[PDB]
């Protein structure tokens, strides 16, 4: 009980928070893992989508290696200030936070070899530009870009832990209008002036459902157009009837189009 306490106290002693593992050595190889829970509120007016996920980062710090305790520790929040962690961030974010109730949803887990696992529960609002030139028959491709803030690829190297099995829980998302057709994982090195920074990317393809629009928007207009055509079978001598039918059909079409604008 006290043995593990003194062990972690000794571990913290002589540890430089400002310095990454192996400053002069090869880059620390950090693996990312994501478990999605929702892509709810895919807004078209704001061009963004709200995404909730559980986000693990996995690396190997030799400075924190310990022996004599086969149990893997779960030393969490004092360590959240007293250890170095990657400076990973989401590039296309607009506003994000870590869930805080009841406690801060964060988890640090150490291992005897020195391996460190760092899990967070994050809700973000990631921008997703959309090409609505074929709306409501459109098909969008949203992305989440993950990148190291300051460090260059010679210092930190990102990769998808488990390969294509890194991202899980894609089947759990159920959007009202869209339907996830495919999800893809990509790993690149973006070359800025400072240097080649690592990058990971999680892309989703979204296909919009058409039934609501055809039920509410298109063929009602077709029916009103047919009602306009009805005027041709009415006798030419009758003037009030045909004029009233034509102008009221015009009014109904303007009403339909305008109200469709008013909620779209």
């Amino acid at each position: 009980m006290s043995f593990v306490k003194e062990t972690v106290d000794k571990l913290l002693k002589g540890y430089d928070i400002r310095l990454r593992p192996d400053f002069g050595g090869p880059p620390v190889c950090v693996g990312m893992n994501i478990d999605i829970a929702s892509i709810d509120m895919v807004s078209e007016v704001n061009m963004d989508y709200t995404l909730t996920m559980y986000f693990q980062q996995y690396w190997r710090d030799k400075r924190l290696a310990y022996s004599g305790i086969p149990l893997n520790l779960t030393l969490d929040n004092r360590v959240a200030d007293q250890l170095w962690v990657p400076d990973t961030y989401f590039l296309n974010d607009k506003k994000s936070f870590v869930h805080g109730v009841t406690v801060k949803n964060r988890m640090i887990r150490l291992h005897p070899d020195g391996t460190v696992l760092y899990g967070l529960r994050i809700t973000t609002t990631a921008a997703c530009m959309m090409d609505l030139r074929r709306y409501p028959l459109d098909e969008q491709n949203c992305t989440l870009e993950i990148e190291s803030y300051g460090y260059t690829t010679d210092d930190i190297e990102f990769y998808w832990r488990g390969g294509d099995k890194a991202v899980t829980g894609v089947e759990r998302i159920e959007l009202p209008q869209f339907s996830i057709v495919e999800h893809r994982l990509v790993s690149r090195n973006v070359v800025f002036a400072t240097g080649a920074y690592p990058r990971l990317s999680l892309s989703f393809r979204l296909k919009r459902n058409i039934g609501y629009f055809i039920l509410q928007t298109y063929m009602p207009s077709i029916l009103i157009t047919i009602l306009s055509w009805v005027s041709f079978w009415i006798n030419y001598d009758a003037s009030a009837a045909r004029v009233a039918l034509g102008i009221t059909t015009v009014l109904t079409m303007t009403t339909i189009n305008t109200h469709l604008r008013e909620t779209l």
Partner: nanobody, 108 residues
């Protein structure tokens, strides 16, 4: 003289909005000539070629004109037009560009 190049794209051009012109001279690696965005109202040229070329966008056939003008013998090289993703980083670095043309040679 003035030899206006034409660069056309086919496919999901929306996913790769920015497109730019590079040039590879004999014995000299690829260099950045210019770049233009999706809307086409913003452009960025290199210092060596500024004030003389005017990249343009029309979208009639996804065309990206270059409008070569005030040509000089030093400005001879195989010109490529390439496309870049929305989140790729800098313009001046060929590594950030994904899809590349075959190249076209200009000598005058």
């Amino acid at each position: 003289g003035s030899l206006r190049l034409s660069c056309a794209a086919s496919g999901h051009t929306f996913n790769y909005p920015i497109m730019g012109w590079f040039r590879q001279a004999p014995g000299k690696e690829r260099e950045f000539v210019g770049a233009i965005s999706w809307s086409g109202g913003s452009t960025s040229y290199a210092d060596s070629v500024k004030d003389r070329f005017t990249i343009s966008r029309d979208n009639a056939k996804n065309t990206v004109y270059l409008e070569m003008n005030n040509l000089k013998p030093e400005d001879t090289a195989v010109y490529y037009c390439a496309a870049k993703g929305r989140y790729s980083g800098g313009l001046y670095y060929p590594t950030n560009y994904d899809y590349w043309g075959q190249g076209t040679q200009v000598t005058v």
